[PDB]
Design a protein around this ligand. Structure first.
Ligand code: NA
Ligand code: NA
Length: 335
């Protein structure tokens, strides 16, 4: 399998762009920063609000847990390559402790909450707006040869007053090289695409579009997580109970994959459950025929069949939000 969009970005670009294992990290000065307040704990890092001790400027300090140097260099290189792109978090500095050599990443202060915190106070219009903003981040990173590989509500930070979205936590992101077999142990279970669950290792940017579809289904149907499996096998079972097993058979045959016998027995046989069966009185204000059609075009087993980020932005569901962006950009271009 190879990506059908942005296929050769890292073939055309030289090794200095994507060869993160060779990066010579330009460390800043740890003494410039001080932790102020803990913000969150995660599997690979702890996040704090911090300050520059020289200027009192606020920042976010992400203290990385012990991991291989290659993974740290990867995140740094990706953040450096994407810095300044639309709706991508901005890396400001990289420092490490004098004695332990533990690295920290220093980011702009984001002044935001994650997408889930916002769910209860968002309307249909706000969902269309913020999903479009997330699509802009994904189209940009994909266009720069990078897959995020961990799209989920906690990695989408929103400053709701400024109507500003940022895609954060690039620690699982990778460069896309056509032909490369990647580790399938990425993303978070409920957002893993079927490629990760059937051991299709030569996946691409389209993984992020599955993850986005899972987020979108959870939002519009008020069912979080939408696919709630109890392990990686059961995650495929939950998907198959909705998409059905006929299309799973087609996918496996197309990519010359054989389900593990245990997984085959767990998945069994299932007819599809139409999207309309998830509508109820409590979520109907967020659902429309356009929303269902958009979702259906994201949640396809075959990664090549899914909408790309740019194709998603052109879907009728976003027609008004796209038009508003186009008009704004026009006036700024005339200015
Ligand atoms: Na994760
Ligand atoms: Na297909």
């Amino acid at each position: 399998s190879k990506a059908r969009v942005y296929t050769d970005v890292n073939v055309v670009r030289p090794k200095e762009y994507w060869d993160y294992e060779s990066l010579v990290v330009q460390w800043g000065h740890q003494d410039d920063y001080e932790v102020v307040r803990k913000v969150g704990r995660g599997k690979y890092s702890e996040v704090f609000e911090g300050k520059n001790v020289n200027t009192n400027e606020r920042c976010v300090i992400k203290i990385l847990k012990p991991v291989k140097k290659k993974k740290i260099k990867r995140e740094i290189k990706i953040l450096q390559n994407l810095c300044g792109g639309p709706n991508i978090v901005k890396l400001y500095d990289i420092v490490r402790d004098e004695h332990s050599k533990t690295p920290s990443l220093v980011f702009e202060f984001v002044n935001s909450v994650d997408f889930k915190v916002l769910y209860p106070t968002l309307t249909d219009y706000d969902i269309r707006y913020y999903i479009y903003e997330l699509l802009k981040a994904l189209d940009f990173c994909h266009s720069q040869g990078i897959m995020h590989r961990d799209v989920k509500p906690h990695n989408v930070m929103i400053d709701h007053q400024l109507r500003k979205l940022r895609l954060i936590d690039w620690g699982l992101a990778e460069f896309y090289h056509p032909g490369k077999e990647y580790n399938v142990r990425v993303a978070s279970r409920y957002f893993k695409g079927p490629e990760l669950l059937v051991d299709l290792q030569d996946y691409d940017y389209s993984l992020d579009m599955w993850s986005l579809g899972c987020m979108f289904a959870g939002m519009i149907f008020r069912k979080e997580p939408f696919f709630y499996g109890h392990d990686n096998h059961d995650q495929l079972v939950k998907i198959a109970k909705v998409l059905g097993t006929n299309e799973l058979d087609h996918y496996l045959n197309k990519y010359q994959l054989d389900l593990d016998p245990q997984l085959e027995a767990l998945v069994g046989r299932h007819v599809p459950k139409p999207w309309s069966k998830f509508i109820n009185a409590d979520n109907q204000h967020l659902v429309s025929p356009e929303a269902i059609d958009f979702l259906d075009k994201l949640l396809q087993y075959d990664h090549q069949d899914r909408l790309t980020a740019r194709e998603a932005m052109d879907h009728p569901y976003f027609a008004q939000v796209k038009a508003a962006e186009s008009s704004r950009l026009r006036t700024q271009l005339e200015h």
